[PDB]
Amino acid sequence: NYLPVIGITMGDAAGVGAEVVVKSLAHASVYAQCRPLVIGDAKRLERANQIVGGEMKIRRIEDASEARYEQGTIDCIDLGLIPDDLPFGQLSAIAGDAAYQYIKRAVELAQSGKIDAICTAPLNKEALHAGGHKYPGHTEMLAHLTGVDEVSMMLVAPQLRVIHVTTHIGIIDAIRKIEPGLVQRTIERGNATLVKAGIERPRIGVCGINPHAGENGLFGYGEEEEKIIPAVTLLQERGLDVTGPLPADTLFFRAGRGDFDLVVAMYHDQGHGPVKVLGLEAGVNVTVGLEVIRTSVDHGTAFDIAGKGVVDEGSMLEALRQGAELATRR
Amino acid sequence: NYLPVIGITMGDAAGVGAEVVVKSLAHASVYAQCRPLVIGDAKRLERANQIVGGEMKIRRIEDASEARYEQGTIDCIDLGLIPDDLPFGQLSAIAGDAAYQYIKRAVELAQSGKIDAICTAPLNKEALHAGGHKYPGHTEMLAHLTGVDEVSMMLVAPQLRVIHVTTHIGIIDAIRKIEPGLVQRTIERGNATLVKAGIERPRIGVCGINPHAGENGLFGYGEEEEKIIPAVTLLQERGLDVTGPLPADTLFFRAGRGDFDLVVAMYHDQGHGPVKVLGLEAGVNVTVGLEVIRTSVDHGTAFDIAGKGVVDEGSMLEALRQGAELATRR
Ligand SMILES: [Ca+2]
Ligand SMILES: [Ca+2]
Ligand SMILES: [Mg+2]
Ligand SMILES: [Mg+2]
Ligand SMILES: [Zn+2]
Ligand SMILES: [Zn+2]
DSSP: OOOEEEEOOOOOOTTHHHHHHHHHOOOOOHHHEEEEEEEEOOOHHHHHHHHHHHOOOOEEEESGGGGOTTHHHHHHEEOSOOOOOOOOOOHHHHHHHHHHHHHHHHHHHTTSSOSSSSEOOOOOOOHHHHTOOOSSHHHHHHHHTTSSSOOOOEETTTEEEEEEEEEEEHHHHHHHHHHHHHHHHHHHHHHHHHHHOOOOOOOEEESSSSGGGTTTTTTSSSHHIIIIHHHHHHHHHHHEEEEEEOHHHHHHHHHHHSSEEEEEESSHHHHHHHTTTTTOOEEEEEESSSSSSSEEEEEETTTTTTTTOOOOOOHHHHHHHHHHTTTOOO | OOOOOOEOOOOOOOTTHHHHHHHTTTTTHHHOOOOHHHHHHEEHHHHHHHHHTOOOOOOOOOOOGGOOOOEEEEEEOOOOOOTTTOOSSOHHHHHHHHHHHHHEEEEEHHEEEHHSEEOOOOOOOHHHTTTTOSSSSSHHHHHHHOOOOOEEEEEEEEEEEESOOOOOOHHHHHHOOHHHHHHHHHHHHHHHHHHHEEEEEEEEEEEOGGGGGTTTTTEEEEIIIHHHHHHHHHHHHTTTTEEEEEEEEHHHHHHHHSSSSSESSSHHHHHHHHHHOOOOOEEEEEEEESSSEEEEEOOOTTTTTTTTOOOOOOHHHHHHHHHHHHHHOO
């Protein structure tokens, strides 16, 4: 029905972002899923088109309303920041600043409702810093500019959406970090994102910390009752459809069967293993809790191959697809 | 190829074991996979056959060599322990002892090389104790009679075999329990069982404790280096094909692709979630470290339905199939 507008940020101009965007938008499949709007540098996209041997024309626009989404011609909100001769594959404070400016513009468009999702091409933290934007990372920058303190990481597969209470932390520290506030906010973020994506009443299942969710006290130190159950109870009383804590393995079986719209995993491997085992296109991370859904790829600026036309666009295509499926419905 | 002999133990005569055994062996598919030998009570199997409306005849035999494996006629190593009138659905000291005696006989047969796998029908712990056999459970009794201090639990799916260093224990205590001796033995058990099943040099992948296996010390308290790596190195030096610790999720991806014959999971949910998400026939547990592979079903003696002919044999069929696949090759 509605084809969502996806704001695609070009990332660091010295890295593979421009090339991967231009290769991605040569696929007709993209235009079955979304209306792809590039925020970036029009000249850099033209250079990338030459580098990849593409047939893409670039249309310089100022406002999202000017975009036509005609295959063969990329609509680029052109900030004009990148010198024509900026080298590929080397650190650039100018490219770092421009990567920030593309992200800032994306956040602005998301706030005004002019895009329905963000898909971020890679940037380089060192260049970002040199360019005057000393953020801890790409995701942290999006969150700060959006005005939110926390986001959650989600993985998506067929029948499976898995949002994480904790991710990149040691397992012992993970268990310490989980408590009802963070669990509650993780569930809320997942619920809100699925409502935006057109599921009016998301069916949410929540994993235990212990196997079998503790088996009525048989396993563990009461982590379910201390850390999880108070959040679940509060959100049930608010009217959300939340079940758990459940044995994580049983919940994944049921989710795969179609019983749940969302699985809330407590820690990294609990949620990541069941998605990764399926062997699907790797490298896409979903960020939950900004004004619109955001996706990205995990491959980096790849300076060793930047400007050589060899970067593979498969991960980006999947990031766009996942972004389109979770985009805000209008 | 060789059809392995599976020693099927009848379990507790008051429970659903006899019924599920008689229902299972009515399936022609079993006979394409194995030669099914029942250790139990011939009169009880006859009574079960009447109950389930079957057409099975029972042949009383003394020695495994007598078994004919003719469809329609179950070869039963008949210990003659169960009175004809023993009620279904009630605890019995005689039934509890007989369940122990069937297991004991299966262990003897495995030791002499007269069966290639064991598949156990359910028994009842309270009845076992009532018959003078004070074991913590079914699996513990098998281990004790076999002469081993430890076994490991394994789950099997297409392209995935996942053996666990720890299972039913809280997550904090699991990480404490893991140390290099236990890791080493888990890997050894897994390797030996796959060699028995005809994989000369098993390719083994080992999971980390921390996500990303610690990411070079970024996550966690050095658990990989303390608890896992000394075991992996020792076994590599001894000539086993062992890779890890690896990020668990990456390892599951690779295993699903065919890169490993065995995945060594550190704790319950790490290994169980990726198997269960696949949504395949549930209920089957594989015990590794006895003289031959052993499988079993989760469902218990089910005294509430014992003797009524309603017990479903799906789980037991899958337990037989998995047992046949992992049976000792001759
Ligand atoms: Ca975290
Ligand atoms: Ca254990
Ligand atoms: Mg190509
Ligand atoms: Mg039937
Ligand atoms: Zn990760
Ligand atoms: Zn379990």
